[PDB]
Amino acid sequence: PVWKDADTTLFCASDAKAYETEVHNVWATHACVPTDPNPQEIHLENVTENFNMWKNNMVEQMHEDIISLWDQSLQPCVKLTGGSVIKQACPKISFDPIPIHYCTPAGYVILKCNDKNFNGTGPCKNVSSVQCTHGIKPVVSTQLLLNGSLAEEEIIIRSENLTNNAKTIIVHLNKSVEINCTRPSDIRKAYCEINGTKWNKVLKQVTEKLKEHFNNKTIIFQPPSGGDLEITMHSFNCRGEFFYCNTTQLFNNTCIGCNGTITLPCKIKQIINMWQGTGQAMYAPPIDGKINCVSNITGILLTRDGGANNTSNETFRPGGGDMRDNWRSELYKYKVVQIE
Ligand SMILES: NCCNC(=O)N1CCC[C@H](C(=O)Nc2ccc(Cl)c(F)c2)C1
Ligand SMILES: *[C@@H]1O[C@H](CO)[C@@H](O)[C@H](O)[C@H]1NC(C)=O
Ligand SMILES: *[C@@H]1O[C@H](CO)[C@@H](O)[C@H](O)[C@H]1NC(C)=O
Ligand SMILES: *[C@@H]1O[C@H](CO)[C@@H](O)[C@H](O)[C@H]1NC(C)=O
Ligand SMILES: *[C@@H]1O[C@H](CO)[C@@H](O)[C@H](O)[C@H]1NC(C)=O
Ligand SMILES: *[C@@H]1O[C@H](CO)[C@@H](O)[C@H](O)[C@H]1NC(C)=O
Ligand SMILES: *[C@@H]1O[C@H](CO)[C@@H](O)[C@H](O)[C@H]1NC(C)=O
Ligand SMILES: *[C@@H]1O[C@H](CO)[C@@H](O)[C@H](O)[C@H]1NC(C)=O
Ligand SMILES: *[C@@H]1O[C@H](CO)[C@@H](O)[C@H](O)[C@H]1NC(C)=O
Ligand SMILES: *[C@@H]1O[C@H](CO)[C@@H](O)[C@H](O)[C@H]1NC(C)=O
Ligand SMILES: *[C@@H]1O[C@H](CO)[C@@H](O)[C@H](O)[C@H]1NC(C)=O
């Protein structure tokens, strides 16, 4: 057939258990339809489509949905919002992101890039066409992208413009790294155990890959030097508890006696700078007992340092804050068009 680049309102789908008390299931149970029981994907032969992950409206729409999900599902005791302040009940909630499918209404279709080393921008020569994206888990975090998909070939570097150092860099890993984070039975004391062996290996590979994009220059990793706790640390939510974990051991250029298990120190903060921008909020103290999540690190968000134009090296620090980049990391291979 034929089509034309177009933006329209998408709808969502899920496998939300209607009996579930969990907040992602509850939101999906009443804001999304059931997943396509017979999903039909059909490859388009001799067709080349130009995709642009950084200028894609599916990002902004999914981002809209996640603010909605969080605003109805999270119960802070007090919300400080731009001069207003609201007290409330803050019961414990059950939190565990479920995949969400995004789907075009009639008159529109979703194009999907299957070029395996597609970097997100430019043309794609193996294009399919779907009614619905795949199941995307909306995991909220900084620096480390958790529980996502992997690049099926090489490690991929994505940025709207690598020459601009204000542009976030998204590295898509081809090998997942486990991050196992516990708060066992100070109650906010917590920690993350990562296999230093595997981690160091793939960071060297990132290093390798990054050097390609930077004329063989020297690649150096550093901790963030400026920003709120949420972006200077690895922030994420595990079972309703906001985790803040120190990344300094995972970005030491020493090991790019150090192959055991890295133990990142962590704190469970009750007062957080909300990622939606609204302000700052307070929550109740953590649950009794063992609070643990085992996640897959599938990508890394990084920022290059400015002012290295005639310098010997390039400096990269873990990044985050704009969580459209997180949706970016899974919606890059997709584009919405209207059948003409
Ligand atoms: N390049 C964009 C700059 N980003 C920015 O200015 N923000 C405003 C202040 C910090 C905000 C934040 O990231 N919050 C947060 C909360 C909970 C979790 Cl779990 C998490 F992963 C993150 C983001
Ligand atoms: C196109 O992508 C499909 C699905 O990812 C995969 O089988 C292969 O890489 C490509 N197939 C052809 C015929 O080009
Ligand atoms: C992505 O690929 C396009 C060519 O399709 C190229 O113009 C662009 O520089 C590449 N970007 C990165 C970050 O590799
Ligand atoms: C972690 O990664 C493996 C493959 O590396 C995958 O099979 C598994 O489902 C992933 N776990 C989660 C929770 O996504
Ligand atoms: C991941 O990509 C790197 C190149 O970036 C490659 O050397 C390595 O073999 C890949 N690993 C896997 C498991 O695909
Ligand atoms: C990328 O960023 C640099 C520096 O901000 C800018 O000079 C340039 O115009 C941008 N785009 C390209 C294609 O280089
Ligand atoms: C995660 O760590 C805890 C304590 O550090 C341990 O009991 C548990 O077996 C670990 N789980 C995995 C999957 O490694
Ligand atoms: C670290 O990961 C490697 C795989 O590369 C594996 O040999 C080992 O199980 C892991 N380390 C520990 C202490 O379990
Ligand atoms: C960058 O270094 C690699 C090292 O393997 C070399 O092969 C390559 O020639 C260098 N750069 C360019 C632009 O060729
Ligand atoms: C992370 O830990 C290092 C020491 O290991 C410390 O110097 C640094 O201040 C910590 N980061 C933050 C944001 O506090
Ligand atoms: C990643 O997925 C696993 C398995 O579904 C889950 O236990 C864990 O909480 C997830 N991690 C995050 C940060 O949501």
Numbering used by the authors: 43 to 124, 198 to 300, 325 to 355, 357 to 396, 409 to 492
Please give me the paper's original passages concerning this structure.
To better understand the structural basis for the role of the LM, HS, and HT mutations in reshaping the Phe43 cavity and in CD4mc binding, we solved the crystal structures of the CRF01_AE 93TH057 gp120 extended core (gp12093TH057 coree) containing the LM+HS changes in complex with two CD4mc compounds: MCG-IV-210 and BNM-III-170. To this panel of small molecules, we added a new compound (MCG-IV-210) derived from a recent high-throughput screen aimed to identify small molecules able to stabilize the CD4-bound conformation. Its structure resembles that of the NBD-556 analogs, but it has a shorter amide linker and an N-substituted piperidine ring. We analyzed the complex structures of LM+HS and LM+HT gp12093TH057 corees bound to the same MCG-IV-210 compound, which displayed the highest sensitivity to position 375 changes among all CD4mc tested. MCG-IV-210 bound within the hydrophobic Phe43 cavity of both gp120 mutants, anchoring deeply into the cleft. The buried surface area (BSA) measurements of the complexes were 678 Å2 (243 Å2 from gp120 and 435 Å2 from the compound) and 699 Å2 (252 Å2 from gp120 and 447 Å2 from the compound) for the complexes of LM+HS gp12093TH057 coree–MCG-IV-210 and LM+HT gp12093TH057 coree–MCG-IV-210, respectively, indicating that more surface was buried by the LM+HT variant. In addition, while the orientations of MCG-IV-210 in the binding pocket of both complexes were identical, the shapes of the pockets differed. The H375T mutation added one methyl group compared with the H375S mutation, and this addition led to the closing of the Phe43 cavity from the top. The increases in BSA for residues lining the Phe43 cavity may further augment the LM mutant stabilization of layer 3, which may provide an explanation for the added potency for MCG-IV-210 in the LM+HT mutant.
The HIV-1 envelope glycoproteins (Env) undergo conformational changes upon interaction of the gp120 exterior glycoprotein with the CD4 receptor. CD4 engages gp120 by introducing its phenylalanine 43 (Phe43) in a cavity (“the Phe43 cavity”) located at the interface between the inner and outer gp120 domains. Small CD4-mimetic compounds (CD4mc) can bind within the Phe43 cavity and trigger conformational changes similar to those induced by CD4. CD4-induced (CD4i) conformational changes in the gp120 inner domain involve three flexible topological layers (layers 1, 2, and 3).
